[PDB]
Coordinates of C-alpha atoms and ligand atoms in Angstrom, one line a residue:
Chain A
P2 CA 111.6 104.3 82.1
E3 CA 112.7 106.5 84.4
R4 CA 112.0 108.4 87.7
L5 CA 109.1 110.9 87.5
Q6 CA 107.8 109.4 84.1
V7 CA 104.1 108.9 83.9
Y8 CA 102.9 106.0 81.9
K9 CA 98.8 104.7 80.9
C10 CA 97.3 102.0 80.4
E11 CA 95.4 103.0 77.3
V12 CA 92.5 99.9 77.9
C13 CA 92.0 99.8 81.5
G14 CA 93.0 103.4 82.5
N15 CA 95.5 102.7 85.5
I16 CA 97.7 105.8 85.2
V17 CA 101.4 105.3 87.5
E18 CA 104.6 107.4 87.9
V19 CA 107.9 105.9 87.9
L20 CA 109.7 106.3 92.0
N21 CA 112.9 103.7 90.7
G22 CA 114.0 103.2 87.0
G23 CA 114.1 100.2 85.7
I24 CA 114.9 98.8 82.4
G25 CA 111.9 96.7 81.7
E26 CA 108.3 98.0 80.1
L27 CA 105.6 98.8 82.3
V28 CA 103.1 96.5 81.2
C29 CA 98.6 96.5 81.4
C30 CA 95.9 95.0 79.4
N31 CA 98.4 93.0 77.7
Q32 CA 100.6 96.0 76.0
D33 CA 103.1 98.7 76.9
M34 CA 101.4 101.6 78.4
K35 CA 101.6 104.5 77.1
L36 CA 104.6 107.2 78.1
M37 CA 102.9 110.4 78.2
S38 CA 105.3 112.6 77.5
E39 CA 104.6 116.5 78.5
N40 CA 103.2 118.9 76.2
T41 CA 102.5 116.4 73.2
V42 CA 99.4 116.9 73.3
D43 CA 97.4 118.8 70.6
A44 CA 95.5 121.2 73.2
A45 CA 94.7 124.8 74.7
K46 CA 97.6 125.8 75.9
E47 CA 96.7 128.5 77.8
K48 CA 94.5 126.0 79.7
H49 CA 96.9 123.3 80.0
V50 CA 100.4 124.9 80.7
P51 CA 100.8 125.9 84.6
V52 CA 101.5 128.9 85.3
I53 CA 103.6 129.5 88.8
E54 CA 103.1 132.1 90.8
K55 CA 105.7 132.8 93.4
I56 CA 104.6 133.4 96.8
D57 CA 106.8 133.8 100.4
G58 CA 107.2 130.3 101.7
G59 CA 106.6 128.7 98.2
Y60 CA 104.6 128.5 95.1
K61 CA 101.0 128.5 93.9
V62 CA 100.5 126.9 90.5
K63 CA 97.0 127.5 88.3
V64 CA 95.9 125.9 85.1
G65 CA 96.3 128.0 83.2
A66 CA 96.3 131.2 82.2
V67 CA 92.9 130.6 81.5
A68 CA 91.2 128.3 83.8
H69 CA 90.8 124.8 82.7
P70 CA 87.0 123.3 83.4
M71 CA 87.1 120.8 86.2
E72 CA 83.5 119.0 85.2
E73 CA 83.4 115.2 86.2
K74 CA 84.1 113.9 82.6
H75 CA 86.4 116.9 81.5
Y76 CA 89.4 118.0 84.9
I77 CA 92.5 118.5 86.3
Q78 CA 93.3 115.5 88.3
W79 CA 96.6 116.8 90.1
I80 CA 99.1 119.0 89.9
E81 CA 102.5 118.4 90.5
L82 CA 105.3 120.6 91.8
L83 CA 109.3 118.7 91.0
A84 CA 112.0 120.5 92.9
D85 CA 115.3 119.2 93.7
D86 CA 114.6 116.1 95.4
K87 CA 111.2 116.4 95.7
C88 CA 107.9 115.5 94.1
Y89 CA 104.6 117.2 95.8
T90 CA 101.7 115.7 94.2
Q91 CA 98.1 117.5 94.9
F92 CA 95.5 115.4 93.9
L93 CA 92.3 117.5 92.6
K94 CA 88.6 116.6 92.4
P95 CA 85.7 118.3 89.8
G96 CA 84.4 121.9 90.9
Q97 CA 87.3 122.6 92.7
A98 CA 89.7 125.2 91.0
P99 CA 92.2 124.3 89.1
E100 CA 94.7 125.3 91.3
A101 CA 97.1 124.4 93.7
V102 CA 99.4 126.1 96.7
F103 CA 103.4 124.1 98.0
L104 CA 105.3 125.5 100.3
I105 CA 108.9 124.3 99.5
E106 CA 112.2 126.4 99.9
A107 CA 113.7 126.5 95.9
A108 CA 114.4 128.7 93.7
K109 CA 113.6 126.5 90.4
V110 CA 111.0 124.2 90.3
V111 CA 108.8 122.7 87.1
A112 CA 105.5 122.3 87.9
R113 CA 102.5 119.7 85.6
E114 CA 99.7 119.0 85.6
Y115 CA 97.2 115.8 84.2
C116 CA 94.0 116.6 82.2
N117 CA 92.4 113.0 81.5
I118 CA 91.2 114.3 78.3
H119 CA 94.6 116.3 77.6
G120 CA 96.9 114.5 79.3
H121 CA 100.5 116.2 80.3
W122 CA 101.4 119.3 80.8
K123 CA 104.5 120.8 82.6
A124 CA 106.0 124.2 83.0
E125 CA 109.0 125.9 84.6
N126 CA 110.4 129.0 86.1
Chain B
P2 CA 95.5 98.4 91.1
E3 CA 94.0 101.9 93.4
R4 CA 95.8 105.2 94.0
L5 CA 98.4 105.4 96.0
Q6 CA 100.0 101.5 96.0
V7 CA 103.2 101.2 94.8
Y8 CA 104.4 98.4 92.9
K9 CA 108.1 96.8 91.9
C10 CA 108.9 94.7 89.5
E11 CA 111.0 91.7 91.1
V12 CA 113.1 91.5 87.2
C13 CA 114.4 94.6 86.5
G14 CA 113.6 97.3 89.6
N15 CA 111.4 99.6 88.2
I16 CA 108.6 100.6 91.2
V17 CA 106.0 102.5 90.3
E18 CA 103.0 104.5 92.3
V19 CA 99.6 104.6 91.0
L20 CA 98.4 107.7 90.1
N21 CA 94.8 106.4 88.8
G22 CA 93.4 102.8 89.1
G23 CA 92.1 100.5 87.3
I24 CA 90.9 96.6 86.5
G25 CA 94.2 95.6 85.3
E26 CA 97.0 94.0 86.6
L27 CA 100.0 95.9 86.2
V28 CA 103.2 93.7 84.8
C29 CA 106.6 94.0 83.9
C30 CA 109.3 91.2 82.7
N31 CA 106.8 88.7 82.3
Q32 CA 105.3 88.8 85.3
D33 CA 102.7 90.5 87.4
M34 CA 104.5 93.7 89.1
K35 CA 104.7 93.3 93.0
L36 CA 102.4 94.5 95.7
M37 CA 104.5 96.7 98.2
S38 CA 102.2 95.9 101.1
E39 CA 103.3 98.4 104.3
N40 CA 104.4 97.3 107.6
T41 CA 104.9 93.5 105.9
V42 CA 108.7 92.8 105.7
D43 CA 110.7 90.7 108.5
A44 CA 113.1 94.0 109.3
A45 CA 114.0 95.9 112.4
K46 CA 110.7 97.8 113.8
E47 CA 112.7 100.8 114.9
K48 CA 115.0 101.1 111.6
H49 CA 111.8 101.5 109.4
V50 CA 108.6 102.5 110.9
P51 CA 108.4 106.4 110.4
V52 CA 108.3 108.3 113.2
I53 CA 106.4 111.3 112.7
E54 CA 107.3 114.7 114.6
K55 CA 104.8 117.8 114.9
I56 CA 106.5 121.3 113.8
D57 CA 105.9 124.9 113.5
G58 CA 104.4 124.7 110.2
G59 CA 104.1 121.2 109.1
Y60 CA 105.6 117.3 110.1
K61 CA 108.9 116.3 110.3
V62 CA 109.1 112.4 109.5
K63 CA 112.4 110.3 109.7
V64 CA 113.5 107.0 109.9
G65 CA 112.8 105.7 111.8
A66 CA 113.3 105.9 116.4
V67 CA 116.9 104.5 115.1
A68 CA 118.0 105.8 112.5
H69 CA 118.3 104.1 109.6
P70 CA 121.6 102.8 107.4
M71 CA 121.9 105.4 104.5
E72 CA 124.8 103.4 102.7
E73 CA 125.1 102.7 98.8
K74 CA 123.7 99.7 99.5
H75 CA 121.5 100.2 101.6
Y76 CA 119.4 103.0 102.4
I77 CA 116.1 104.6 102.5
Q78 CA 115.0 105.9 99.1
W79 CA 112.3 108.3 99.7
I80 CA 110.0 109.7 102.6
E81 CA 106.2 109.8 101.9
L82 CA 103.9 111.7 103.7
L83 CA 100.2 111.9 102.6
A84 CA 97.5 113.9 104.0
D85 CA 93.8 114.8 102.8
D86 CA 94.5 115.0 99.1
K87 CA 98.2 115.9 99.3
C88 CA 101.2 113.2 98.2
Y89 CA 104.7 115.1 99.0
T90 CA 107.9 112.8 98.6
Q91 CA 111.1 113.7 99.7
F92 CA 113.7 111.2 97.6
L93 CA 117.2 110.7 99.6
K94 CA 120.3 109.7 98.4
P95 CA 122.9 107.4 99.9
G96 CA 125.3 109.6 103.0
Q97 CA 121.6 111.8 103.3
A98 CA 119.7 111.9 106.6
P99 CA 117.1 109.3 106.7
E100 CA 114.6 112.4 107.8
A101 CA 112.3 114.9 105.4
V102 CA 110.6 118.3 106.7
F103 CA 107.1 118.7 105.5
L104 CA 105.3 122.2 105.1
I105 CA 101.7 121.3 105.1
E106 CA 97.9 121.9 107.2
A107 CA 96.8 118.9 107.9
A108 CA 95.7 117.7 111.5
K109 CA 96.0 113.6 110.1
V110 CA 99.0 112.4 108.1
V111 CA 100.4 109.1 107.0
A112 CA 104.4 108.9 107.1
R113 CA 105.4 106.4 104.6
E114 CA 109.1 105.0 103.7
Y115 CA 111.1 103.0 101.2
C116 CA 113.9 100.9 101.7
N117 CA 115.7 99.6 99.0
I118 CA 116.3 95.7 100.9
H119 CA 113.8 95.7 103.5
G120 CA 111.1 97.6 101.2
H121 CA 107.7 99.7 102.3
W122 CA 106.8 100.9 106.5
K123 CA 104.0 103.6 107.2
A124 CA 103.3 105.2 110.3
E125 CA 100.1 107.7 111.5
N126 CA 99.3 110.3 113.6
Ligands
LIG1 CA1 98.5 87.5 87.0
LIG2 CA1 104.2 111.4 93.5
LIG3 FE1 91.7 119.6 79.2
LIG4 FE1 116.3 99.1 105.5
LIG5 FE1 95.1 98.1 81.9
LIG6 FE1 110.6 94.5 85.4

């Protein structure tokens, strides 16, 4: 695995992000954890692809063009901003607006979000 | 596993951080991944415990009271700041200063750092 990749155990639900890569295959509940590749699930793009808005001193990210649901059983678990060697994560809770604000200096950034039902999604400016 | 925990495979070097918990144990290279509990390694505290400094708009974190080495074989791989539901990480590289600046509004924060040789360390304000 490589740094920044997100893996999930489909049996018990553990989800982890790689901080340091290696050659070993991550395992949980007797099976290889699944790589959650971005933008691969068949889901509404207008509700899952992050929309990046440049603000003074940082970025505002919303999921998505159409506000994604934030219900107990279906919500955006976190929004992450990747810039240079920075990885900022904003965890969310059902009931909150599917958005996040990050104060950072970087012209080029990548925004990612994870939906408990529809998986991993990303956008970039 | 629980959110925020850091695990390492002592065989291949994979290191991951938990985003979503679960009941199954993380395994790699045929053995349980090691839980990297903070401040448990027998190393120089003055070089590993993060020192949190309040600055205008956020916090500056340095590792540690005495600058930790940043050599090819021994360096601080990243500095993380935890506040509310925010998890901000700054990955570093040999040759860089063992410090990181985070712009954030949070009265209570926890700063963590990981040394490739001496493990996981933390401090809080
Ligand atoms: Ca075991
Ligand atoms: Ca992270
Ligand atoms: Fe969804
Ligand atoms: Fe060290
Ligand atoms: Fe599992
Ligand atoms: Fe391994």
